[PDB]
Design a protein around this ligand. Structure first.
Ligand SMILES: Nc1ncnc2c1ncn2[C@@H]1O[C@H](COP(=O)(O)OP(=O)(O)NP(=O)(O)O)[C@@H](O)[C@H]1O
Ligand SMILES: [Mg+2]
Lengths: 303, 68
């Protein structure tokens, strides 16, 4: 009979939607302060889905970092759960890169540094995100230089120190790690593989692994079969390629960690190591990357 | 991830894959989309007869707003 969200917050327009959530702008009425309310209708959830919802809420409460969405409040009502986050208004990172038109390695390095700081924080708190991908990288605001914010802890899991386990087949196909595809025990390194996929896209605007046949895609991932083809990779610094190679290492025990990646010279010495040259082809490809993503989901939604 | 798909986003995405043309071609759909998704639009997109039409021009705009 307690209805604290209904009593104290006013909902406005939809900011986004998930498979089983809607995110609406809300205002804490007494304060006049805006937030984002992630709302899950709980009336028809299975027992396992309740457990996943409770897990996301616990993990979101735990994570306080400048590059991670920040939970303000959490409210349970009869048929609804509300996760109330600080509002981020900059939209998706990849949409912003295209909209601002110009992009260099130095920009990509600054961006992946923030993603790695967020990932490191998760890992230091015993959380593996498992779903790092462009759609979960938001920007804090429309201000130039706004912070990247890692979002959507709906697939995140809790690990104990460095122990690996079969935590299940979860994630998004193009970002899945070899160890997950092999059904091997896994842990924190899965996030660094995904970071390597993201970094590759930030440099050239298309994904390292891509095949319409998903069986073949997974074969390519498991084989680590990516390339740095000419001409676009000819102008990418050796240090950027080196960091990608170390993230896209099939053996998760040899794959670079978030802490180590933050010390890599292309990150830590970005001002002297990363190229400042604008990469027009990268932005043009990213525009098509974003378009293919949108149509893939919209063509399936219409089917 | 955000699952919201709007008509303006779908039309603009098709227009991007059509290299900014006001229509899209079958071979462009086959290059850019999964073979299954490439055949779907090819079967359900009406012929484009607007400004700058060519043989094979498909009206992704009419297709898109029919749904979204
Ligand atoms: N704090 C926030 N501020 C503003 N918009 C937000 C915020 N959190 C989420 N959104 C928007 O809502 C969308 C969906 O949020 P998300 O947490 O990814 O939902 P989800 O239900 O877990 N999606 P999915 O699991 O991929 O089906 C995001 O992509 C943003 O567009
Ligand atoms: Mg989710």
């Amino acid at each position: 009979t307690c209805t604290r969200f209904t009593e104290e917050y006013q909902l406005f327009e939809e900011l986004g939607k998930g498979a089983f959530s809607v995110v609406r702008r809300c205002v804490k009425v007494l304060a006049g302060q805006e937030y984002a309310a992630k709302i899950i209708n709980t009336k028809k959830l299975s027992a396992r889905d309740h457990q996943k919802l409770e897990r996301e809420a616990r993990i979101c409460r735990l994570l306080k970092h400048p590059n991670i969405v920040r939970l303000h409040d959490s409210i349970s009502e009869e048929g609804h759960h509300y996760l109330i986050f600080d509002l981020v208004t900059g939209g998706e990172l990849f949409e912003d890169i295209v909209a601002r038109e110009y992009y260099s390695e130095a920009d990509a390095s600054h961006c992946i540094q923030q993603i790695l700081e967020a990932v490191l924080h998760c890992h230091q708190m015993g959380v593996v995100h498992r779903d790092l991908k462009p759609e979960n990288l938001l920007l804090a605001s429309k201000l130039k230089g706004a912070a990247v914010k890692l979002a959507d802890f709906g697939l995140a899991i809790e690990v104990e120190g460095e122990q690996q386990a079969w935590f299940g087949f979860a994630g998004t196909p193009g970002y899945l790690s070899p160890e997950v595809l092999r059904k091997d025990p896994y842990g924190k390194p899965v996030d660094l593989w995904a970071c390597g996929v993201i970094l590759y896209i930030l440099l050239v605007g298309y994904p390292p692994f891509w095949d319409e046949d998903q069986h073949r895609l997974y074969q390519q991932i498991k084989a680590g079969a990516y390339d740095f083809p000419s001409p676009e990779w000819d102008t990418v610094t050796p240090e950027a390629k080196d960091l990608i190679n170390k993230m896209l290492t099939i053996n998760p025990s040899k794959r670079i960690t978030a802490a180590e990646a933050l010390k890599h010279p292309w990150i830590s010495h970005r001002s002297t190591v990363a190229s400042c040259m604008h990469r027009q082809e990268t932005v043009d490809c990213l525009k098509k990357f974003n378009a293919r993503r949108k149509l893939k989901g919209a063509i399936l939604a219409a089917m | 991830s955000n699952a919201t798909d709007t008509a303006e986003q779908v039309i603009a995405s098709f227009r991007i894959l059509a290299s900014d043309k006001p229509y899209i071609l079958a071979e462009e759909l086959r290059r850019e989309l999964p073979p299954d998704q490439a055949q779907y639009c090819i079967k359900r997109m009406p012929a484009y007869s607007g400004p700058g039409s060519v043989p094979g021009a498909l009206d992704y705009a009419a297709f898109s707003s029919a749904l979204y």
